[PDB]
Amino acid sequence: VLSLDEGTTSARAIIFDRESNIHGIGQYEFPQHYPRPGWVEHNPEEIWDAQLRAIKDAIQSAREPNQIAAIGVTNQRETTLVWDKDGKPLYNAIVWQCRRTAEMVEEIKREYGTMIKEKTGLVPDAYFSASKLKWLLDNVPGLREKAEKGEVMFGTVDTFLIYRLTGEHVTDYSNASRTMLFNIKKLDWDDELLELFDIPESVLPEVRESSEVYGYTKKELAEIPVSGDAGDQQAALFGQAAFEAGMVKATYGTGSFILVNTDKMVLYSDNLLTTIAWGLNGRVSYALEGSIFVTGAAVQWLRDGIKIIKHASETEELATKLESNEGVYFVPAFVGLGAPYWDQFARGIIIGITRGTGREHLARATLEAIAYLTRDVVDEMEKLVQIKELRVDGGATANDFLMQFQADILNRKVIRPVVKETTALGAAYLAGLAVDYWADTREIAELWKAERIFEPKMDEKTRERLYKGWKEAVKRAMGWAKVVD
Amino acid sequence: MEKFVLSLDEGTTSARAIIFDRESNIHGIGQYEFPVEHNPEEIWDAQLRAIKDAIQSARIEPNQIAAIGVTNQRETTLVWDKDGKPLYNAIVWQCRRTAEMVEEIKREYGTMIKEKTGLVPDAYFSASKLKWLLDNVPGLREKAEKGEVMFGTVDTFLIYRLTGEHVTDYSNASRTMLFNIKKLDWDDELLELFDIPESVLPEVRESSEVYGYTKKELLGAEIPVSGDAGDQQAALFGQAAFEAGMVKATYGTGSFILVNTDKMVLYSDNLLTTIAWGLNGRVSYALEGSIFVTGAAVQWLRDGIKIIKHASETEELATKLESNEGVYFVPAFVGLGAPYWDQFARGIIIGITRGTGREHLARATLEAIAYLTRDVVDEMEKLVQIKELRVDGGATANDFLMQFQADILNRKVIRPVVKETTALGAAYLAGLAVDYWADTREIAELWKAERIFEPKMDEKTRERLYKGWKEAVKRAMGWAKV
Numbered sequence: 001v002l003s004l005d006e007g008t009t010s011a012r013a014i015i016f017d018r019e020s021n022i023h024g025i026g027q028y029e030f031p032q033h034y035p036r037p038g039w040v041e042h043n044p045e046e047i048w049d050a051q052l053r054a055i056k057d058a059i060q061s062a063r064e065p066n067q068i069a070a071i072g073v074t075n076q077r078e079t080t081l082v083w084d085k086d087g088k089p090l091y092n093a094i095v096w097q098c099r100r101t102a103e104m105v106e107e108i109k110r111e112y113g114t115m116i117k118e119k120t121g122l123v124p125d126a127y128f129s130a131s132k133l134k135w136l137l138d139n140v141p142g143l144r145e146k147a148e149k150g151e152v153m154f155g156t157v158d159t160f161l162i163y164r165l166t167g168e169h170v171t172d173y174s175n176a177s178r179t180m181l182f183n184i185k186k187l188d189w190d191d192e193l194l195e196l197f198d199i200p201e202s203v204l205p206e207v208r209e210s211s212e213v214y215g216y217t218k219k220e221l222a223e224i225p226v227s228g229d230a231g232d233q234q235a236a237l238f239g240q241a242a243f244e245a246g247m248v249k250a251t252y253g254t255g256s257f258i259l260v261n262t263d264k265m266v267l268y269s270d271n272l273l274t275t276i277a278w279g280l281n282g283r284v285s286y287a288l289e290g291s292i293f294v295t296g297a298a299v300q301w302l303r304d305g306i307k308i309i310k311h312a313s314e315t316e317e318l319a320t321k322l323e324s325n326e327g328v329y330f331v332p333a334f335v336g337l338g339a340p341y342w343d344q345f346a347r348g349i350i351i352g353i354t355r356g357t358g359r360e361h362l363a364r365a366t367l368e369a370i371a372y373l374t375r376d377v378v379d380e381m382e383k384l385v386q387i388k389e390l391r392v393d394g395g396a397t398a399n400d401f402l403m404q405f406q407a408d409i410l411n412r413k414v415i416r417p418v419v420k421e422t423t424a425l426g427a428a429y430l431a432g433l434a435v436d437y438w439a440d441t442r443e444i445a446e447l448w449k450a451e452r453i454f455e456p457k458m459d460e461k462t463r464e465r466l467y468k469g470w471k472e473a474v475k476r477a478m479g480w481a482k483v484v485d
Numbered sequence: 486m487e488k489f490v491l492s493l494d495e496g497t498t499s500a501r502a503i504i505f506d507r508e509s510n511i512h513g514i515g516q517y518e519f520p521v522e523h524n525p526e527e528i529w530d531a532q533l534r535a536i537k538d539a540i541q542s543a544r545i546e547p548n549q550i551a552a553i554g555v556t557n558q559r560e561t562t563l564v565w566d567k568d569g570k571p572l573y574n575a576i577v578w579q580c581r582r583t584a585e586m587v588e589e590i591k592r593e594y595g596t597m598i599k600e601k602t603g604l605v606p607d608a609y610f611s612a613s614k615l616k617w618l619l620d621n622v623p624g625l626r627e628k629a630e631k632g633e634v635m636f637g638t639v640d641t642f643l644i645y646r647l648t649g650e651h652v653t654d655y656s657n658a659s660r661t662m663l664f665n666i667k668k669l670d671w672d673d674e675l676l677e678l679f680d681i682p683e684s685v686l687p688e689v690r691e692s693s694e695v696y697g698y699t700k701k702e703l704l705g706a707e708i709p710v711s712g713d714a715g716d717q718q719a720a721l722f723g724q725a726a727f728e729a730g731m732v733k734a735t736y737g738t739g740s741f742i743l744v745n746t747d748k749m750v751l752y753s754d755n756l757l758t759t760i761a762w763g764l765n766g767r768v769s770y771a772l773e774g775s776i777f778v779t780g781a782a783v784q785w786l787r788d789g790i791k792i793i794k795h796a797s798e799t800e801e802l803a804t805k806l807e808s809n810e811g812v813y814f815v816p817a818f819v820g821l822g823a824p825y826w827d828q829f830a831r832g833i834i835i836g837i838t839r840g841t842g843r844e845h846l847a848r849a850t851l852e853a854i855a856y857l858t859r860d861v862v863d864e865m866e867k868l869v870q871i872k873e874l875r876v877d878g879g880a881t882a883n884d885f886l887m888q889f890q891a892d893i894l895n896r897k898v899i900r901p902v903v904k905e906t907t908a909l910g911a912a913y914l915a916g917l918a919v920d921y922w923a924d925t926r927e928i929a930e931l932w933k934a935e936r937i938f939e940p941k942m943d944e945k946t947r948e949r950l951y952k953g954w955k956e957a958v959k960r961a962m963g964w965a966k967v
């Protein structure tokens with residue numbers, strides 16, 4: 001099985017065996033386009049070749065085409081694209097990170113805020129596709145005509161990847177829940193959101209399950225079946241065998257993303273997202289999500305902005321030089337705050353800077369920030385549902401200290417799996433099931449192995465003192481971009 | 486022979502001595518660092534070896550030194566005996582060790598203090614540090630009541646070792662917080678409150694007055710020590726800021742700003758009211774604001790987060806940008822004062838996005854130094870028109886800082902050719918007492934200006950940046966309290 005892990009920064013491809021060991025990798029980046037302050041765009045051509053060119057590294061290290069059982073696909077979510085019947089991108093993709101629609105959304109919020117959330121699960125925000133589409137049909141000349149004329153297909157990244165792969169125009173339930181046009185209850189596009197955002201039905205894909213045969217590849221390109229699809233963060237949940245209500249994973253990447261499987265129960269949170277975990281065997285599993293836009297990206301900024309480190313790994317030793325953060329906090333809201341704050345205007349703050357503050361306090365305040373952002377989500381989840389422990393993946397989870405401190409301020413176990421590329425695993429597992437490469441989810445769930453379990457060993461008083469300083473630091477990051485210009 | 490004035494610039498991190506002629510040209514320089522506390526003996530021979538360096542560099546005899554002028558880090562409290570032995574290290578002005586000892590004297594008495602002395606009570610000042618010495622230091626109070634002990638700031642010390650005299654001028658005395666600056670003698674009530682016996686207090690004279698003469702056994706001549714003021718108000722004097730409304734800012738580890746207010750005493754709730762100097766039997770008053778961390782914030786970009794090698798580097802980094810792009814840096818390392826008085830405030834950088842680089846920290850740090858000044862200059866504008874800024878200190882080398890400082894203040898910023906103005910200031914005071922210069926009018930004409938930075942910034946832009954600063958300062962408030 002071959003998994004396509006088309007991320008936000010870098011397109012992965014990976015190949016697994018029924019025991020879930022990797023037999024090939026292939027990763028390539030591609031430019032992150034910023035036409036204007038706060039705007040993030042991807043050229044779908046740069047994305048697409050980076051993807052296939054990266055399949056080949058995983059192929060060429062795996063040692064034959066039709067020896068491939070199926071293809072699974074997982075994508076950076078909400079990122080919005082458009083193309084023609086010959087498969088050509090009609091404009092750049094507007095990444096999930098892009099803020100160009102912050103205020104086209106804002107007006108619409110008040111009259112429609114609770115109706116958008118009630119149908120779709122989503123805090124309305126320029127994060128999700130619906131406003132991204134309305135821009136593309138309102139600003140790209142000829143697109144409405146061409147769509148009212150019937151020549152236009154929209155999709156999120158999975159839907160695009162599945163196209164050049166297959167010829168089919170599909171998406172799963174999980175990626176569709178992310179568009180803020182899909183009614184996660186009724187399980188179909190929601191007509192009065194198609195209205196509100198003025199989006200012609202002639203454009204939307206076909207929502208199908210997450211384990212399904214959508215179609216087969218072009219023989220040029222074996223005839224492999226494309227048989228699995230979920231949103232990037234959703235698959236991580238699958239890859240973690242989070243196949244039960246109550247189970248929680250937390251991906252640490254550019255940003256962190258924390259999901260509680262809920263399968264048949266749909267839960268509501270004012271400050272959190274209700275989306276779809278996956279559709280599987282005529283059953284739709286649900287989830288509650290907290291999406292934190294900037295975590296690991298702060299460690300990056302220590303490397304490329306002020307350049308006080310050369311490698312992200314330098315953080316652990318820089319940070320463990322101190323017994324505590326000595327009152328130094330780093331709220332790294334480079335682009336505003338994700339959940340639960342939903343402050344688009346908050347900007348990144350460092351606070352507590354005496355004459356003795358050195359690189360060590362920076363590095364520590366960054367890793368602490370990552371674990372603090374996570375606990376903000378989890379605390380908010382406990383206002384309705386019990387969170388026992390964190391299965392955990394992503395690049396930053398290499399950091400023995402981060403992982404440790406995460407568990408210490410959470411007073412819960414933090415459990416690092418033996419598998420790393422969990423997001424790909426899940427896209428494999430999904431593609432697997434539908435083409436009996438695996439019998440059941442219970443079989444899959446038994447090859448999931450716990451590589452290390454971080455035990456919380458921190459004082460309750462100490463834990464509350466540090467997180468009270470976190471909250472105060474956050475208060476001071478709020479609303480800064482409507483002050484400064 | 487042709488003669489010269491010797492200046493004694495006894496800093497806080499360095500003891501300099503410079504030799505001057507009628508044209509303020511510098512013929513010889515010696516400075517030697519010493520190692521909050523300072524050891525008298527250490528600072529003395531660090532200074533003393535720095536005299537000989539300066540005389541050697543000029544190729545001159547003790548015969549040519551027509552007068553000695555003394556400036557010094559002010560406030561710093563010292564105690565000695567009949568021949569000059571320190572009876573405990575110097576409690577330097579930076580010492581926050583009487584801090585809470587003044588907070589409980591603060592409510593009761595503070596308003597009565599500022600009325601008498603000009604000063605909002607603080608650790609900082611001289612009177613608390615010297616009661617500390619009668620209390621704590623082993624059985625000192627018992628001695629100082631026999632007449633056995635002399636007290637003074639750094640200036641009185643030097644002018645004891647040099648001279649045999651037990652003196653100080655008005656300006657240094659105005660900083661003791663024992664000197665009533667309206668009555669111009671030591672104030673009886675401030676002695677009572679802090680438990681000091683006058684058999685301890687130096688005699689206060691003008692800032693331009695032959696106090697005595699050096700021992701031949703030290704310098705080789707019996708030179709007169711004829712000028713004395715606190716190194717801040719001597720930069721003021723060295724800036725030829727002799728008329729009222731004249732202003733100088735010193736950009737160092739902190740900054741200091743003083744306005745000569747001459748024959749009238751001004752009051753401000755968030756500004757110190759002190760003495761510029763006595764001169765020709767005439768006391769001239771001044772208005773001072775202080776910032777504790779200005780250039781020390783640059784010191785931290787290199788010593789702390791270690792993102793520049795030499796402070797020099799800020800210029801090249803900051804001009805890469807043409808705005809702070811919303812990145813600000815309030816370096817409240819130890820707190821805020823004029824006009825926020827929040828000791829619990831701490832340093833913050835805000836505006837960080839994916840692309841905040843060293844350029845924005847460099848540009849934010851220079852803008853801060855510029856903004857903190859404006860804070861003090863605007864507090865003066867609540868009372869008196871501050872027309873323009875004469876400017877000295879290491880940071881004034883940063884040609885960017887200076888143009889920006891002018892830009893946000895919409896005022897000419899003036900860099901003088903002479904750069905060691907604290908030194909030059911004490912020499913004029915010495916030189917004048919010995920007809921080296923005739924009057925200040927001769928010095929005004931002699932003194933001259935190097936570069937003059939001109940405001941060229943939009944009234945719109947100038948206020949959008951500064952509102953950025955204030956809203957930034959709000960979010961540093963009260964951080965150590967919480």
Ligand SMILES: Nc1ncnc2c1ncn2[C@@H]1O[C@H](COP(=O)(O)OP(=O)(O)NP(=O)(O)O)[C@@H](O)[C@H]1O
Pocket residue numbers: 005006007008009010076232252253254255295296297298299300312313315316394395396397398399402
């Ligand atoms: N040892 C470490 N300590 C701290 N942060 C780390 C460490 N290793 C990696 N990171 C951070 O983790 C990120 C890379 O994580 P990664 O698992 O590649 O997520 P990702 O590629 O952004 N997911 P995607 O959205 O699919 O592109 C960067 O922000 C790194 O700075």
Ligand SMILES: Nc1ncnc2c1ncn2[C@@H]1O[C@H](COP(=O)(O)OP(=O)(O)NP(=O)(O)O)[C@@H](O)[C@H]1O
Pocket residue numbers: 496497498499736737738780781783784796797799800878879880881882883886
């Ligand atoms: N070119 C520069 N640009 C910006 N900041 C500078 C520059 N040069 C020095 N600085 C900083 O500003 C101060 C330099 O002023 P300087 O007068 O050399 O300080 P100082 O020696 O502590 N003053 P003092 O003890 O009273 O004689 C230091 O704190 C430096 O960090």
